[PDB]
Amino acid sequence: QPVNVQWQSHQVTLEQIQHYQLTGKLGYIAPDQRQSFNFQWQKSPQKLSLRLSNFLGQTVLNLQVDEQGARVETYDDQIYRDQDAQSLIRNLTGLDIPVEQLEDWILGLPTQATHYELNEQNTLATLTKLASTEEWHVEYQRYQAIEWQHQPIPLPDKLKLQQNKTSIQLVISQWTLLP
């Protein structure tokens, strides 16, 4: 089996995309709760902001991740801090969102220690990741070509994540790639 040069080159380009915004819908289904959220995801080097709001626009949760750790402002404006964003969100809301892994998956990058399959366009089709006893199955349902430094690059615009009984369906509205 030869190295897939197109896939490896795509990875290097994705690794350049360090400052960006992303908006869309996040559909959450689990045995304990079902939710339909607007999401606003803002990424910069070593930093992440994620706002979830309800279908009427009111804030459900605001997450900030930086070098100090994770900070969540909850729906009722209580403030909580801890070291791991996924664990903190789960303890405060019951929602299981693999925030750390999504920093790679949302762009179409794999994490380390993962299995995956490519599509015929040499980008991710499906991926599996065993993380903290959760076996995540990720499906890249659709890509959209987005301009990056004057070149069209495929980025996910429909992505589904599932582990156990929990599924997260992301549907993208707008990628905004920043200098």
Numbering used by the authors: 33 to 211
Original authors' sentences:
In Gram-negative bacteria, N-terminal lipidation is a signal for protein trafficking from the inner membrane (IM) to the outer membrane (OM). The IM complex LolCDE extracts lipoproteins from the membrane and moves them to the chaperone LolA. The LolA-lipoprotein complex crosses the periplasm after which the lipoprotein is anchored to the OM. In γ-proteobacteria anchoring is assisted by the receptor LolB, while a corresponding protein has not been identified in other phyla.
